[PDB]
Amino acid sequence: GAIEPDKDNVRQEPYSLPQGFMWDTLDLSDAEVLKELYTLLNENYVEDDDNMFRFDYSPEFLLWALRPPGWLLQWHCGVRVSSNKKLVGFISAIPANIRIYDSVKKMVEINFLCVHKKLRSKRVAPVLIREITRRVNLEGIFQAVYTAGVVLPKPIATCRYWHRSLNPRKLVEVKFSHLSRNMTLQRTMKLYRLPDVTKTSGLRPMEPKDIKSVRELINTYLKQFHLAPVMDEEEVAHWFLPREHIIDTFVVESPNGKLTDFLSFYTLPSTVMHHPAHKSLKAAYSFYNIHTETPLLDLMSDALILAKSKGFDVFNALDLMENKTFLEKLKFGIGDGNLQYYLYNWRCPGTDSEKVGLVLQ
Template identity: 30%
Template sequence: MDETTKLKQVAKLLKSGYTPDQIYCELNPPTDKLSAMKKKYSFWNTQPVTKINEEVIEEGEINKLTNVPSKSIGLPDTFEWKIFNNKNDQDTKFIYDFLSKNYYEYGEEDFRLNYTYSFLKWVFNNPRGIYLVGIMKNDKLYGFISGVKTEMIINQEIVNTIDVNFLCVDYKMRNKKMSTSLIKEITRLANCDNISVGIYTSARYLPKPFTSVNYFHRPINFKKLVETGFCTIDKDADLNSASKYYDLDNTNDDNFVLMEKKHIEDAYECFKEYMQKYNFCPNYDIKTFEYLFLNDQVVSYVMLENDKVIDFISYYKLNCKSKNKIISVGYLYYYSSLKTTIYKLFENLLRVAKKNEIDVITLNTFMENQSIIDLSQCVEGTGSLHYYAYNYRIKDLQHNQIAKITL
């Protein structure tokens, strides 16, 4: 936002009765509860979400579905709604071009995620189904939001939801409340399909997260991470010596092998059993499991015992960039740790990632990841990721009660 736009925004907020603290929060989105309590949240306070100071007593759906509008909500001027076809490669390319120029969601402020066309095509073709919603004007895309149909287990209750992601507005239109229109429209579309609950994450603190997790990184190519500014060392430290701290031995576990189609059934059973320990996790069927873990975007390995799968672990691949510097990042994805410690699984995965020329593995503090963080030379990142439910109240959950990964 340039200075002229910012001054106009300040004047408008003052006229509307905002205090200086509230104006600051409007221009600098809150990242924690303390700063969020100063913000008015004119949109979110009208929505069926847990309020900032609300203590959840009874969990469950907030509003039952009644009188769902059959028509899209109105848009100003000559803007119009566009429902994209996930099977149409041109539509995917159109969305990819828009996101590559306008999507900035990432925990590290100085680095931007580089979502590739092939990655988006994989996400958009989830067999459960997806909503791809845009706002257009004169054949140009100005706003976009997606939502994958996802069956979740929330404190032992099976809940049909949409997993909302890629909310993005053209950077020149970000004070036009276009994001609220996108949220309302994807909500309406889901409601038309009898889905009333949404799941989403954000680096911003909104009303109100039921848990928040932190980013950690396990360096692999430490020298490159320092040279690109992703990691730092003391000015008096020797880079070669520091890099040795993150060296990996070349010990290969012969029972740790790349997941193949023949492993899917056993790996799926491991996944289902392992998810039972969590309070918030997806309830995938075997078709969705195979689609998510056996593809070109996710690297999945299984641990064998007498040729039978006893556990698995995976990561998905994305690059991040800053000032034309590219870092290859592996994001720790789902795993099971029934008979194999997560530390052993992760150490084997690190060796695979190194061979695949991954520079760093990024993970959050959910599932059993704290054990990895404590034992595997991980370094803390910047920022947090907050988890939200739309039209569903959930009591606060601890990190190790969560097993839901947003791509």
């Protein structure tokens, strides 16, 4: 359970930054500030282990990820250089109802912790963590969930990335992938060829009228996992209604009209930092895929077909939920990255990745 009880005293004044820095609460409704945050992340956020790719979250994507129902302006915490007002730090919290084993707790999800490359090792990130903790506590929330590539003490789970090539030649050219150990490039491309049309009957984009049904579908499905979100109708609409270049959700409407399944994946390109011919890698990420009548394998096959039809170069997925049941069959290849999940102020046994039912952007 909780390590420390809900506090009886929380600091009311912001924590002190090092000299030369100032706090700024970012209002992403100001296109100027949203562009500043986009630039910060596009130039300084997470890169692959060999520094060839760097996340390229779009401004619209940041709006989708950072303002779900109940979002708070004070939880978009930025840090600027005082002398020239340049944005050099950021961290964010968004509210969520998170079920850990049997306990449904109001928590925050922490994300987008980023400090400018030139202003690192100045102990800015620890102050950012303290300050977001303070701002969350003052709203009456004392647990958090988050993910990281770094191995910190006592993760609740470790998940592995897998990758399904959709544009093998490009992936090989930019060194995201490599030539098969014993096949020509051409035979590799033939190996990963997908059908031109989906197979599942009744597969169609999600629409507003689907909200409640989708809610019903996900909250039931997620019951089997040890860590998972619990979503109300507003949250379902936010996280799953299609937004072009951001989030795609397809539902399976049975003949009578009931929804029986749905698949979803979000759009998250990577900058290719040093290639003479390629500047970006278009990647889809598996989000939440719920099955009650369609086999999960056919579901994810259709997901791959749709991502391909939409011009994606690769389809990524973690080995959580039931994903291990289709990863190898659908020709995913194991990635070189591990994602750890962590709970703040909650002590509980760790679990396996297939018992993790939470996906963060």
